[PDB]
Ligand binder design. Structure first.
Ligand code: ZN
Lengths: 141, 38, 131, 136, 94, 130
RNA sequence: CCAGGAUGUUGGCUUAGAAGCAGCCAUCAUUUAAAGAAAGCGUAAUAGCUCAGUCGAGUCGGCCUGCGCGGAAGA
């Protein structure tokens, strides 16, 4: 809403609270602490559910801590426990591989109340159904 | 620069200019693209 | 590139048909603004993220000309951006007014509320209208 | 290289190259390399010219060779007096008249066509021009 | 469809034909039906662009000579030895 | 030769022999044949490397490790510096010690520990036979 | 020329990590005047560059052809 001012985004999942092997000191080398990623981070994360890769802005000024506001995570994390399989595609397009559907990912991408453009629950609804088929999957809509 | 009868525009920043009567290739992104004798 | 004749006739023909049913069409200057700001303005007016669009003085001139409208050329000087309302009370002037949060007015050149022309010194009058 | 696997004769006279060419239109592919100048193409020039285009197109499409040497050339080595019998065949050439469809290509875009023949024409001694299949 | 303005020739032979190719023109001939052949001299450039279309060899043509539209069809065409030009085209009354 | 499980399934004894000496040798040839038969491959030691390089020569140490055919695991931030963790063939570590001190005036330092044995790189697998 | 050059989305698989910009695929949608699941450089991955309303009438590049240029350095 202003301009550039620090805003990285590197995570693996909502479960791993401030990991190290995946990233670690990579999530805090300019203004973020490789420790406070559990205080302000899990400030409400453990109050809901930890299992969905949820990124987040940084926003740093010069007041030690940071005021990062977590938001809706990628819609791809819903293609492993909300769409179907978690991986294993075998062959790209030489095979239809898997297949999603209409009802599927319908009320899954609807929960989003901090993203998506246009409230039209028909244009912003199918906006999260393109990739679900871009991976060789069939369209049962 | 590399001088040789043949001179062309390698990158898109190339320019075929004629000075005194000799074709040259000026560049502002790679000194290696400098040519002469076109 | 450019747009073919037939492809240009429709563009103006459309913006004209929507101007005949538009209950409002305020004009203002939007230079030096960013997308995050434009979007924010679009989110405020309509959750659809669709609001406030930039158009040339020409596309608008012949659009406002293709429809029985006069005395608006002064509103088309250089960078021009239109904001119409095809539905609901055209009292959405307060939204943009508060958005610009400017102590002046100039930016909001003019507008046309319910087929009634209004200068820049009237943008506040409508922006201060009670519920 | 390209050369007659068998010939009724080993040697042949000079043979002047006059008149125009026959193969001017493409009747095998959609594109092809046409000749413009006058001269003769050796087995090496033809082969080398084939590799160029065939390489610029990876392993897709198909190429044709309308031309063919079928003409032996004799030459005498150094330190050899004139006469003493006709020289020995060293290589085979092919008379190319202005308008001789040298090569042809099909199964690939038109853009990739010129590029392919462009790297092959540079191998040819005479000038060439790009042509496209025409109806009738 | 394709209107081609033409003019009856006043002299035949390779000599005249060549003089035509040296003035953006080329020899032609319209044979067919019970009518007798007619020497025709068409414009190079004009026909050079008309033959560029495949519809020129498929659809019927209309040659206008001395105030007369004769519906003919491209039977055969002789192209230049190596240059993108035309030498002579045969038309058939149909 | 290491990392292999050997099993015995069939055999027999004969008219005069049958001795600890006989079957001792009988086992030798069996192994030689098998190792050469089961697609042989080299195993080089991979080291765990931690490179501290200013805060400014950090990005330079990373790029250098990537070129050494190593595999970055992730970089840790220490003080006003950075610690880069990665695996790299003790083989290919060849001169990193000094190549690293050269791009840091010595600013950087590093520690190396053994981690595990992995299967070599085809190119190197040919140079070994002799 | 001064401008803008966005959003779903860091598209899915792969991978140490690939986010337009190794590589397999896929290439729909979107708010629009317009923005490719992306031209070239650049990153370790990001970042950062960046190509594809004003001014007010001219601009873009293939074909045939004339005349020239470089290619061309000897006692
Ligand atoms: Zn250059």
């Amino acid at each position: 809403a202003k301009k550039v001012q620090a805003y990285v985004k590197l995570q693996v999942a909502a479960g791993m609270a401030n990991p190290s092997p995946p990233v670690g000191p990579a999530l805090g080398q300019q203004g973020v602490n490789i420790m406070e990623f559990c205080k302000a981070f899990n400030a409400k994360t453990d109050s809901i559910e930890k299992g969905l890769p949820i990124p987040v802005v940084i926003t740093v000024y010069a007041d030690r801590s940071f005021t990062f506001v977590t938001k809706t995570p990628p819609a791809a994390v819903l293609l492993k426990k909300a769409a179907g399989i978690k991986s294993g595609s075998g062959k790209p397009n030489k095979d239809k591989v898997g297949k999603i559907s209409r009802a599927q990912l319908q009320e899954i991408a609807q929960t989003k109340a901090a993203d998506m453009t246009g409230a039209d629950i028909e244009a912003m609804t199918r906006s999260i159904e393109g990739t679900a088929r871009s991976m060789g999957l069939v369209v049962e809509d | 620069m590399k001088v040789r009868a043949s001179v062309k525009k390698l990158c898109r920043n190339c320019k075929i200019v004629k000075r005194d009567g000799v074709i040259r290739v000026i560049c502002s992104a790679e000194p290696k693209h400098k040519q002469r004798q076109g | 590139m450019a747009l073919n004749l037939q492809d240009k006739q429709a563009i103006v023909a459309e913006v004209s048909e929507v101007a005949k049913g538009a209950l409002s069409a305020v004009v203002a200057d939007s230079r030096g603004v960013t997308v995050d700001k434009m979007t924010e303005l679009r989110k405020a007016g309509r959750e659809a993220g669709v609001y406030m669009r930039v158009v040339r003085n020409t596309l608008l001139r012949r659009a406002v000309e293709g429809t029985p409208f006069e005395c608006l050329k002064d509103a088309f000087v250089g960078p021009t951006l239109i904001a119409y309302s095809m539905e609901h009370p055209g009292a959405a002037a307060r939204l943009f007014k508060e958005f610009a949060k400017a102590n002046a007015k100039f930016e909001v050149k003019a507008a046309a509320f319910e087929g009634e022309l209004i200068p820049a010194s009237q943008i506040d009058r409508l922006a201060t209208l009670p519920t | 290289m390209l050369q007659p696997k068998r010939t009724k004769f080993r040697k042949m006279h000079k043979g002047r190259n006059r008149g125009l060419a026959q193969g001017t239109d493409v009747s095998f592919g959609s594109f092809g390399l046409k000749a413009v100048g006058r001269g003769r193409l050796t087995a090496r020039q033809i082969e080398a010219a084939r590799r160029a285009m065939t390489r610029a197109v990876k392993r897709q499409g198909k190429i044709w060779i309308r031309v063919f040497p079928d003409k032996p050339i004799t030459e005498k080595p150094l330190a050899v007096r004139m006469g003493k019998g006709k020289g020995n065949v060293e290589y085979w050439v092919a008379l190319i008249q202005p308008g001789k469809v040298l090569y042809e290509m099909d199964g690939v875009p038109e853009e990739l066509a010129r590029e392919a023949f462009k790297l092959a024409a540079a191998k040819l001694p005479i000038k060439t021009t790009f042509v496209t299949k025409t109806v009738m | 469809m394709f209107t081609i303005n033409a003019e009856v020739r006043k002299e035949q032979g390779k000599g005249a034909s060549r003089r035509l190719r040296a003035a953006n023109k080329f020899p032609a001939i319209i044979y067919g039906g019970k009518e007798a052949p007619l020497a025709i001299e068409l414009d190079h450039d004009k026909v050079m662009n008309m033959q560029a279309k495949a519809e020129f060899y498929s659809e019927v043509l209309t040659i206008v000579v001395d105030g007369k539209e004769i519906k003919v069809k491209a039977q055969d065409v002789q192209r230049h030895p190596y240059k993108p030009k035309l030498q002579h085209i045969d038309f058939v009354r149909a | 030769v290491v990392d292999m499980g050997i099993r015995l399934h069939f055999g027999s004894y004969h008219d005069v022999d049958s001795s600890e000496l006989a079957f001792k040798l009988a086992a030798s040839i069996a192994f030689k044949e098998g190792f050469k038969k089961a697609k042989p491959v080299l195993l080089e030691p991979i080291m765990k490397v931690e490179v501290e390089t200013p805060e400014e020569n950090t990005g330079d140490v990373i790029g250098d490790l990537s070129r050494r055919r190593g595999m970055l695991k992730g970089q840790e931030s220490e003080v006003t510096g950075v610690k880069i963790h990665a695996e790299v063939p003790l083989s290919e570590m060849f001169g990193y010690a000094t190549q690293l001190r050269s791009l840091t005036k010595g600013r950087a330092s590093y520690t190396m520990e053994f981690l595990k044995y992995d299967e070599a790189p085809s190119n190197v697998a040919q140079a070994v036979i002799e």
